[PDB]
Amino acid sequence: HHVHPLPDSVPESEDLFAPPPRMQGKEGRPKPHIGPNYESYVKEWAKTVGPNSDEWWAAKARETLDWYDDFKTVRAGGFEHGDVQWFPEGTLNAAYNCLDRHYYKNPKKTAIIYEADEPSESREVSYEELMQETCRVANVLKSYGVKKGDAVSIYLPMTWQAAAAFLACARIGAIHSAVFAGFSAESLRDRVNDCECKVLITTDEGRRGGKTIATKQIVDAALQQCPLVENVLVLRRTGNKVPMTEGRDKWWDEECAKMPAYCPCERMASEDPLFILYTSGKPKGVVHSTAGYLLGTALTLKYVFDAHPDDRFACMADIGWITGHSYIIYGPLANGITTAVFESTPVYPTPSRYWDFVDKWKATQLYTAPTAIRLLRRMGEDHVKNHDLSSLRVLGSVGEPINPEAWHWYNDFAGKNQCAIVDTYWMTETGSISIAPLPGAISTKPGSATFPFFGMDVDIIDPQTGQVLEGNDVEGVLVARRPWPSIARTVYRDHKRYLETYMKPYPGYFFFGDGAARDYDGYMWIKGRVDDVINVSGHRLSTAEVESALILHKGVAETAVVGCADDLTGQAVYAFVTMKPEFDLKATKEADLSKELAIQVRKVIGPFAAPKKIYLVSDLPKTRSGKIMRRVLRKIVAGEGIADPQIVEEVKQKVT
Amino acid sequence: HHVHPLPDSVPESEDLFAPPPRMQGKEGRPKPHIGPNYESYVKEWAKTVGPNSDEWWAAKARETLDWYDDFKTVRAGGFEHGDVQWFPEGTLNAAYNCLDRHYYKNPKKTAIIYEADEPSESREVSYEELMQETCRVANVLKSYGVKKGDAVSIYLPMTWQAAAAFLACARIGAIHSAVFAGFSAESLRDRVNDCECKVLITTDEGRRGGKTIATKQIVDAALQQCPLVENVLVLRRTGNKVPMTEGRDKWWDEECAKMPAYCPCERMASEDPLFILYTSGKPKGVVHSTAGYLLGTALTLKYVFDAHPDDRFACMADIGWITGHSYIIYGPLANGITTAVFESTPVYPTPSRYWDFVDKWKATQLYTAPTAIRLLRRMGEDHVKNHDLSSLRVLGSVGEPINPEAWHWYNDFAGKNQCAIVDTYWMTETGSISIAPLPGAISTKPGSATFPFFGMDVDIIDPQTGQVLEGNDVEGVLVARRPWPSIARTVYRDHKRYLETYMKPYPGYFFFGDGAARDYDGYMWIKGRVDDVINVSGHRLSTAEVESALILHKGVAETAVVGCADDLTGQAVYAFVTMKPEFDLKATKEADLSKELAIQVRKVIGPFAAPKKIYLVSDLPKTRSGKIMRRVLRKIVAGEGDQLGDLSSIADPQIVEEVKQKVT
Amino acid sequence: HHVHPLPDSVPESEDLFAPPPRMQGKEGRPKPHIGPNYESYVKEWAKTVGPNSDEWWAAKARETLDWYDDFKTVRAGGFEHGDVQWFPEGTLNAAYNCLDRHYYKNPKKTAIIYEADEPSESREVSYEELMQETCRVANVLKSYGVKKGDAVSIYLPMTWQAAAAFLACARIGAIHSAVFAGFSAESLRDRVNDCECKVLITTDEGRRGGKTIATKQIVDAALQQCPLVENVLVLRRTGNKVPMTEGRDKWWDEECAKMPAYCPCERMASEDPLFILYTSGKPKGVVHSTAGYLLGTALTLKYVFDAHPDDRFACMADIGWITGHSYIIYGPLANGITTAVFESTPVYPTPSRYWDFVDKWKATQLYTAPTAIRLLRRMGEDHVKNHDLSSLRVLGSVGEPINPEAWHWYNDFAGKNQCAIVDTYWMTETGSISIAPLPGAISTKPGSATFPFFGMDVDIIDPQTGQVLEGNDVEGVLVARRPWPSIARTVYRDHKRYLETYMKPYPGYFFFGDGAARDYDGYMWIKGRVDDVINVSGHRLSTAEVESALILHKGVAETAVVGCADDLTGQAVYAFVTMKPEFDLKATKEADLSKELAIQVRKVIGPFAAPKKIYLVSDLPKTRSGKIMRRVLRKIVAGPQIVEEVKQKVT
Ligand SMILES: Nc1ncnc2c1ncn2[C@@H]1O[C@H](COP(=O)(O)OC2CC2)[C@@H](O)[C@H]1O
Ligand SMILES: Nc1ncnc2c1ncn2[C@@H]1O[C@H](COP(=O)(O)OC2CC2)[C@@H](O)[C@H]1O
């Protein structure tokens, strides 16, 4: 076979992990909605794609959501000009489907488990409390003149009120634009100005990992260049002395005390914009409609994680990420279950924090990024070994390919080999999970996204010819043939960039921008960004298979390989390797470590995949979501031309 | 028994007035919807409360109102945090339920009987005319940029166009804030600024009691401190020269002439705010939603007054009062009947005006306040005795406890002992009538509100312990157990004050602020405000029983007793008595009359209730709705005159100076 | 008989044209919705009028349109106070019924045949393309802050994007106010200021008949006196170097490139205003609601022209005219057929342009004005004789009474005596066609509108007594007894003028302002405006019969007769006659020609109708819609370059 699984230390015959007993309906656990085998997944999946799927999507839309006005058409439009339409005639409100309809049925059921930065301050927020807080904020926004269609910037840390600020905007038909708390004043400025918002919601200070986020300090600097912002709502999170501008700035609690605890729901057309979300050139504000996005997040959350009514979904991401949008707030609350708002880091107070949380609340699912798993892997298994963690049934990975080493560490310790691992592939532009194994039906492989989700008709294209590589054992670029409900509708006031980025390069398709491969079993392998691909002497090297090989060597915590122009091979491979903090870098020779890694790569991939130069760095350039910034490293090693900015100075200094 | 009826001259066994013949389906009168006995009221009432009442309330809302979008949930929310919800998902429009759907069935039926200040200028306003006037005003407001959710101030006298200005706001989804015509410039300013309205509706002048109300003069003075008001629509009521500011002020007739006579109805969510109404500390803007309030006003009117399609309802109150909101405009027009807009006073041209009106239009119900009833008692029965008044079937009282003396004068002369008397207890914050006898089912008692209305689950609480006084013959503070559709939703931009006033003092309940008593027959007695109670040597005195005792003495027209701290008795009783203007002044010594009143109180209540000092004054401090301002007298008779409020919009503000001068 | 047909050279017994074979269901043509005789038209019409007609109107509204929310009441209000209501409770969107529901059914079906000024640049615009363009413009408007109820001025030539600009406004609930491209800056200014619009849509330049319309040049002059206009969207139609005002003016293509190709449809109540249209004293902004107007245009287009799904409707009018509003955009697109946007004149490149167009696209109906018919009649029959034109089934005339001479030229050459001729009478204030023959059921007469459309119960009133002239063979002023769905709802911010013009003069009726006559056959004859009537010695002379008489004399191309105060006859007749440019007036003495025309009128009408003085002019004062401006001539004999010529001759 030509397409090979990501390098792993386990033999392939022992590397097929079928759904465990917890995902089989045993141990008193809920039977999965999809099961018990791969055919059972395809039987349902094939109903959701092709030109005969309209009846299926219409039925699901009416089952999943509560509509004020029914729709007549199911789908319309296409990629060509960016006129995607789903359920155009229907009306609904997101805050109603995420709050009201569950409050009316069981008001005391916990909507949010608020895990505070300090574990002792954690508490449960019922649907009643969240609904009342949401309605108060909505009335405050109306009193500020916020109208349906106006943009509202949210600059909030991971306190539970962030969901109230999200859903308050959705309740009145406003368009919220959430920005990671802790972004620089310049980054926040650009996103406030691009959405042309007149109202901004923030805190006095944020608390993550025992560190203070000077939110109001940053907002003041940014708004010195944001003339359109007239009202700033400041949530009193810490109570520390922070500057306040009289007239413009008002306290969250004081404003909400003047407002009623109920607010009517604005009846939104399906294609009314629900939110703007800028991704970390110019800031790209991905715009999502209402009904399609909500339906997508609801069904993926229900099917990709096998959600059941009493479950407690624990997504540890930040709401500044689409993962937080879709699988902390909208997805979980749409289905009417409990969701987790994690305010701290995975290592505060100690690297046992994740597992202290899981056993404290009896979390039934855990959702996080590969970068977090690698962080916990390099801290020691003592922090996980002595935990129960039996409430869990599904563990999810999102943001990047998951190295088989991290995959196993996730599977072995967090799941105790009794949880299904769902490597969920998707994008901010996809709205909901696009490719992931259904935990109760699909047998997994370390690092494989497996098979596409409902409504996702994906294929592999030759990047040069542009034609479909039919069959298995093929490698190329991933594309989608048909629109899906939760697909992004535009880029805010830059629809030209929306079409040129995803619709022009391969006409007739959606262009994810990812290299993909379909091995001989039909499993989809998403091996990294197309821009990250390295072509050594006519050999397409993907960063996932190379980095997966490097982590197989003892002591390695994280790696990142980029491409640079080479005299002989056209393009050569350069590697950045982060060793575990408890490595004896003095005992193992630096040059010897490079040779050991080089031979390691040669053994599992091929002679061509060996790095030509290796760089030792304390950490890698990373976004706030956890993605490795390979483009940044690539330009640095080329001479032409976000979590910890100090890594940039270290990388360029080590370049010489 | 411990709980005793309000002082009356009739024994209790001869003081129970069963439903009269007119309310029995006889004398060619419509058979009541509820009857014939008390059991028939309980059988239906029990469907409206308890955990099985959604089935009843859902049916009534859908049968009573026309909805643009149906609702899914019946009720939700509660008192605790002030998130009351009724029919959340439904959409509707008030102006549609009060105008359009009746215009479509019989456009020529009289919607408003306009009783002008001068009787000769009275005329009938059909539903067609009222709808066209409303749609024109709505289009004028739309042309001013008024959007759904915007506030509009109404400063209009009791001319028939006032209903058009109300329903025009409701038609476009705006929130009208009506202020009594004649309020001082300072009082109007504060209410115009508090609702943050940008448009003001007013007249050039108002006409009541043959005197000119310089409305536009007052509006001009107030608007120098109301910067948010950009457009003022002036109704030409008298036509006298009044200042007009070009651009800001434009004439009603001219503006409406540029607009079509139909306007689309904004589809309002059930919980969208319908109106703000400031009640006479800081101005308290009581906010009401749409569907709950509309349903409440409609059902109370249909059941408390036994409304039938052809009836002609005559509420003489002013639209600046919640009684006018609910039982002049919204209540009556929703039910599709005729309602009265009375522009004059009860004594202009003469104290026979009320009864001339009833016999001219053949009014079938009359609704007014005790202050007006006592006033007519004090003018002479020659002005009422020689009237027919046989069209009437139900007489209503609202605003304060009804004195057994006034109740009888109401029953004897206005009704000729052939009308059922409905003592309707409620508040601006309740939206619709809370406690009242159903005329065709309940036998009344002088001064008793009798039994609570549908959807009202009320109880008696000990004000200290906070526990329910179960059973009969109990006395305490009135509370409600469950929300009711028409309950106020908030105080405009002061939801904290809303919760602290009605929801915090007795958590889990609504606190009316009224002392109440449930006698041994189950009848409820609302004996006055809790703030007005006087505790003489640990004995709780309610202002109703004391003033009812005083009114039992011949010659008494009106009284008002307040409390003052006493060294020995803790609190002592002080009385303010307004005797008829033609009493034996100078002939009967002031000191001689004071002793007679004190002994009368000692004879019917007890020695502790005897006033220690009595003050004779020409009138009492009163609001424009007719409530006696006992807080003013209490603070004045306690040396707190410097700490009084904005007593400028009082019915007669000069009476305040008389009380403080009469300090000794 | 007292009521006589308009002067024609054909005998009356040879002047009744029954539905031709193409309109009878033969030759592979669709069965007409109404047929085959007059009784079939009356049988259906009686359901649409009277106090039991709600059942019919409810069914049509629900079958014809797609509603977001259903209605309960059918009709309400009346003429008295101007509170007409139709389907008050229902919601819908015009852009949805004209674009979305057809895009969802067949996106590639051609919505607009765009006939460019140069024939070689013509192309088909599919429903998909038109919908995408509309949604982009709608999103551009929303980004400008345009809200439901805001007015938007449209100053666009006859390029296909004009429909996109119309429907974009309708999509978001805005009220579009279209103004003829080429109107002076003063006329544009007055109409822009009266609607208080915040946004204006125009082109850099327009092209009609090979000439440049400096649209943006005119806009600049007008906006120097239009304070409320903040944003101007300029469509690059020609691309010529034109001034642009930074900030205020932005390009259509550039703005639309920033927007998605879909936009949600605003859910409009039936009586929400759809558009303002000023008619060419002070400018009169006629306002139309949504559901009534849309339903009216749909049914008249379906029945007056016997529209069928695959038909290709060719209305050559301009969208600045109500004919363009109702029977270029709304009518056809609502019914989901193909419509024509004709950008040129009927004589560019040659007077065969109309007929070259018909055979190129195989148009199934043609709709135009008498002013266009008369122009081509005087250009030579060689340009029409040698064309196929067999795709046509119905030819329509609109704007003014159709002279029997032009009527025959229409039927003889353009129709080849195989098309039904529909003389459609209505006004901007009626919304849709009021009186017209149903082509598959009614036998026509040259110059007669025949019978009123469904829902139109019209009558004749004696202009003096004010009483109804019941029966046939009656002549007077035309009025309507009951409101009809598409009736105009008001005049923008002048409901007083609206009531005084149409509702006050004859209370209880709608006053069209036209002299009318109902002959012994029940046929209705619209003989001209009441203001144009001439009372010679107590004889009511209508301009149609007098001008029809003048056109019966050979060499006459167009005429216009006005009234004059006379000492003896009370009112005297003055005639303005336009002879063909290739007439040798130098050979024929002026006085000789006048006597021949004067006697001609004496022969066909009577001695009293003879003009007292006849004036020879190259052309007549005309609007852009084609109506003859008789008021101009009337005051001229008392105390666009044609005005200078007319005043000099009478001296
Ligand atoms: N399961 C996965 N396997 C391999 N690669 C993955 C996977 N999930 C994400 N990615 C990478 O992250 C981008 C998305 O990031 P984004 O923040 O836009 O959306 C985030 C996902 C919510 C993908 O385009 C790709 O490059
Ligand atoms: N039948 C009654 N018996 C005894 N007291 C009554 C009665 N009606 C009103 N009140 C007093 O008036 C306040 C409300 O006045 P408001 O103007 O807000 O509402 C007015 C009533 C529409 C009550 O709280 C109470 O103190």
DSSP codes, A25-53: T-TTPPPPSS-SSHHHHHHHHGGGSSTT-
Query: How close is the nearest chain B Cα to the Cα of C291, in Å?
Result: 12
CA distances (Å), B528 to each of B6, B411, B458, B532, in order? 11, 22, 16, 7
Up-side HSE of residue A243: CA atoms within 13 Å toward CB?
7
Q: Rounded to an integer, what distance in angstroms lies between the CA atom of residue C60 and that of residue C58? A: 6
- C-alpha torsion sign, points A298, A303, A305, A307: positive
Helices (H) and strands (E) in chain B, counts: 21, 30
How many other C-beta atoms can be found within 10 angstroms of the C-beta atom of residue B364? 25
The single residue listed with the structure tokens 């592979």 is C28
- Closest by CA to B485, choosing from B84, B36, B41, is B84
DSSP for residue C468: B
Pocket test for ligand 1, best of A374, A526, A531 (most atoms within 8 A of CB): A526
Atom 4 of ligand 1: nearest residue by CA position: A401
Q: Are C512 and C456 in contact (CB under 8 A)?
A: no
Residues counted in chain C: 651
What chain C residue is nearest to B101 in terms of C-alpha separation?
C73
Mark yes or no for CB contact C260/A73 under 8 Å: no
Q: Rounded to an integer, what distance in angstroms lies between the CA atom of residue C115 and that of residue C124? A: 9
Range list of β-strands (E), C462-552 = 474-480, 490-491, 510-518, 524-529, 534-535, 540-541
Q: Rounded to an integer, what distance in angstroms lies between the CA atom of residue B124 and that of residue A446? A: 85
Highest CATH level, class, for A12-515: alpha beta
Q: Are B114 and B98 in contact (CB under 8 A)?
A: no
Strands B110-115 and B123-126: antiparallel
Q: Rounded to an integer, what distance in angstroms lies between the CA atom of residue C474 and that of residue C522? A: 10
- Closest by CA to C479, choosing from C5, C38, C57, C79, is C79
Residues paired with A213 in a beta bridge: A206
Q: Are A24 and A440 in contact (CB under 8 A)?
A: yes
- C-alpha torsion sign, points B474, B480, B485, B486: positive
Q: Rounded to an integer, what distance in angstroms lies between the CA atom of residue A157 and that of residue A175? A: 19
Q: Based on the number of CB atoms within 10 Å of its own CB, is A349 exposed (0-12), middle (13-18) or buried (19 or more)?
A: middle
Ligand 1 atom with minimal separation from the A326 CA: 22
- C-alpha torsion sign, points C14, C16, C22, C24: negative
- Closest by CA to A173, choosing from A84, A260, A104, A95, is A95
Q: Rounded to an integer, what distance in angstroms lies between the CA atom of residue B223 and that of residue A96? A: 41
Would you state the structure tokens that stand for residue A416, as one six-digit string? 């105790």
Q: Is B73 on the interface with A (CB under 8 A)?
A: yes
Residues of chain B contacting residue A257, judged by C-beta atoms under 8 Å apart: 495-496
What chain A residue is nearest to B89 in terms of C-alpha separation?
A68
Per-residue buried b or exposed e for B611-626, using 16+ beta carbons within 10 Å of the residue's own CB = beebbbbebbbbbbbb
Strands B312-315 and B338-342: parallel
Q: Is B495 on the interface with A (CB under 8 A)?
A: yes
- Closest by CA to A377, choosing from A556, A550, A621, A622, is A556
CA distances (Å), A79 to each of A48, A58, A479, A498, B559, in order? 18, 21, 12, 10, 82
- Closest by CA to A189, choosing from A156, A234, A230, A221, is A221
Q: Rounded to an integer, what distance in angstroms lies between the CA atom of residue B71 and that of residue B74? A: 7
Would you state the structure tokens that stand for residue C71, as one six-digit string? 């209605």
Amino acid at C591: A
Q: Rounded to an integer, what distance in angstroms lies between the CA atom of residue B167 and that of residue B112? A: 13
Pocket test for ligand 2, best of B368, B448, B526, B529 (most atoms within 8 A of CB): B526
SS3 state of residue C161: helix
Residues of chain C contacting residue B103, judged by C-beta atoms under 8 Å apart: 76
- Closest by CA to A74, choosing from A59, A92, A63, is A59
Residues of chain A contacting residue B79, judged by C-beta atoms under 8 Å apart: none
Run of H or E including A566: strand A556-566
Q: What is the phi/psi pair of residue B527, to 5°? A: -100, 5
Closest Cβ opposite residue A493 in set C66, C131, C258? C258
Per-residue buried b or exposed e for C185-197, using 16+ beta carbons within 10 Å of the residue's own CB = bebbbbbbbbbbb
What chain C residue is nearest to A488 in terms of C-alpha separation?
C260
- Closest by CA to C565, choosing from C574, C557, C556, is C574
Query: How close is the nearest chain C Cα to the Cα of B261, in Å?
Result: 5
C-alpha A51: how far from chain center: 29
Q: Based on the number of CB atoms within 10 Å of its own CB, is C524 exposed (0-12), middle (13-18) or buried (19 or more)?
A: buried
CA dihedral angle for residue B567, residue B568, residue B570, residue B571, rounded to 10 degrees: -90
Range list of β-strands (E), A398-523 = 420-423, 458-461, 474-480, 490-491, 510-518
Give all chains having 3 or more CB-to-CB distances under 8 Å with chain A. Answer: B, C
C-alpha C649: how far from chain center: 32
Q: Is A487 on the interface with C (CB under 8 A)?
A: no
Q: Are C359 and C388 in contact (CB under 8 A)?
A: yes
Residue B512 CB–ligand 2 contact under 6 Å: yes
Residue B430 CB–ligand 2 contact under 6 Å: no
SS3 state of residue A1: coil
**Distance (Å) from CA A595 to ligand 2 centroid:** 92
How many other C-beta atoms can be found within 10 angstroms of the C-beta atom of residue A332? 31
CA C549-C550-C551 angle, to 5 degrees, is 90
Run of H or E including A558: strand A556-566
Residue B277 CB–ligand 2 contact under 6 Å: no
Residue B297 CB–ligand 2 contact under 6 Å: no
Q: Is B251 on the interface with C (CB under 8 A)?
A: no
Cis peptide before C463 (omega within 30 of 0): no
C-alpha C217: how far from chain center: 28
Residues paired with C154 in a beta bridge: C178, C201
Highest CATH level, class, for B12-516: alpha beta
Q: Based on the number of CB atoms within 10 Å of its own CB, is B298 exposed (0-12), middle (13-18) or buried (19 or more)?
A: buried
Strands C268-269 and C91-92: antiparallel
Q: What is the phi/psi pair of residue A602, to 5°? A: -60, -30
**Distance (Å) from CA B401 to ligand 2 centroid:** 8
Contacts of B230 (CB under 8 A, 6+ apart): B144, B198, B199, B248
Domain ranges for chain B, please list them: 12-516
Q: What is the phi/psi pair of residue B259, to 5°? A: -115, 155
DSSP for residue B264: P
CA distances (Å), C3 to each of A414, B245, C330, C609, in order? 100, 59, 36, 16
Q: Are C89 and B101 in contact (CB under 8 A)?
A: no
Q: Are A526 and A401 in contact (CB under 8 A)?
A: yes
Q: Rounded to an integer, what distance in angstroms lies between the CA atom of residue B253 and that of residue B203? A: 11
Which B positions 113-142 lie with beta carbon below 8 A of chain C? 131-132, 135, 142
Q: Are B124 and B110 in contact (CB under 8 A)?
A: yes
Domain C12-514 classified CATH 3.90.1150.10? no
Q: Are C102 and C111 in contact (CB under 8 A)?
A: yes
Run of H or E including C498: helix C495-502
DSSP codes, B115-143: E-SSGGG-EEEEHHHHHHHHHHHHHHHHH
How many other C-beta atoms can be found within 10 angstroms of the C-beta atom of residue C34? 20
**Distance (Å) from CA B181 to ligand 2 centroid:** 21
Cis peptide before C349 (omega within 30 of 0): yes
SS3 state of residue B19: coil
Q: Rounded to an integer, what distance in angstroms lies between the CA atom of residue C446 and that of residue B304? A: 71
Q: Are A259 and A140 in contact (CB under 8 A)?
A: yes
Q: Based on the number of CB atoms within 10 Å of its own CB, is B85 exposed (0-12), middle (13-18) or buried (19 or more)?
A: buried
Q: Are B304 and B453 in contact (CB under 8 A)?
A: yes
Helices (H) and strands (E) in chain A, counts: 21, 30
- Closest by CA to A290, choosing from A130, A143, A176, A140, is A176
Would you state the structure tokens that stand for residue C305, as one six-digit string? 């022209």
Atom 20 of ligand 1: nearest residue by CA position: A427
Query: How close is the nearest chain A Cα to the Cα of C142, in Å?
Result: 9
Residue B261 region by backbone torsions, left for phi larger than 0, else alpha for psi between -120 and 50, else beta: alpha
Closest Cβ opposite residue A261 in set B73, B81, B493? B81
Q: Rounded to an integer, what distance in angstroms lies between the CA atom of residue A90 and that of residue A70? A: 5
Ligand 2 atom with minimal separation from the B627 CA: 12
Q: Based on the number of CB atoms within 10 Å of its own CB, is A93 exposed (0-12), middle (13-18) or buried (19 or more)?
A: buried
Run of H or E including A85: strand A85-86
Q: Which ligand is nearest to the CA of B543?
A: 2
Strands B211-213 and B338-342: unpaired
Chain breaks in chain A (C to N over 2.5 A) after: 280, 641
Closest Cβ opposite residue C261 in set A82, A269, A270? A82
Closest Cβ opposite residue C262 in set A77, A89, A494? A77
Amino acid at B114: Y
Q: Rounded to an integer, what distance in angstroms lies between the CA atom of residue A295 and that of residue A217? A: 38
Run of H or E including B630: helix B630-636
Q: Rounded to an integer, what distance in angstroms lies between the CA atom of residue C436 and that of residue C423? A: 6
DSSP codes, B167-197: HHHHHHT-EEEE--TT--HHHHHHHHHHTT-
Q: Is A78 on the interface with C (CB under 8 A)?
A: no
Residues paired with A366 in a beta bridge: A314, A395
Amino acid at A596: E
Residue A449 CB–ligand 1 contact under 6 Å: yes
Mark yes or no for CB contact B77/A261 under 8 Å: yes
CA distances (Å), A592 to each of A547, A548, A579, A581, A588, in order? 18, 20, 14, 18, 7
Chain breaks in chain C (C to N over 2.5 A) after: 280, 639
Residue A526 CB–ligand 1 contact under 6 Å: yes
Range list of β-strands (E), B11-144 = 75-76, 85-86, 91-92, 110-115, 123-126
Closest Cβ opposite residue A494 in set C132, C258, C264? C258
- Closest by CA to C135, choosing from C224, C221, C285, C257, is C257
Up-side HSE of residue A213: CA atoms within 13 Å toward CB?
24
C-alpha C139: how far from chain center: 30
Query: How close is the nearest chain A Cα to the Cα of C645, in Å?
Result: 55
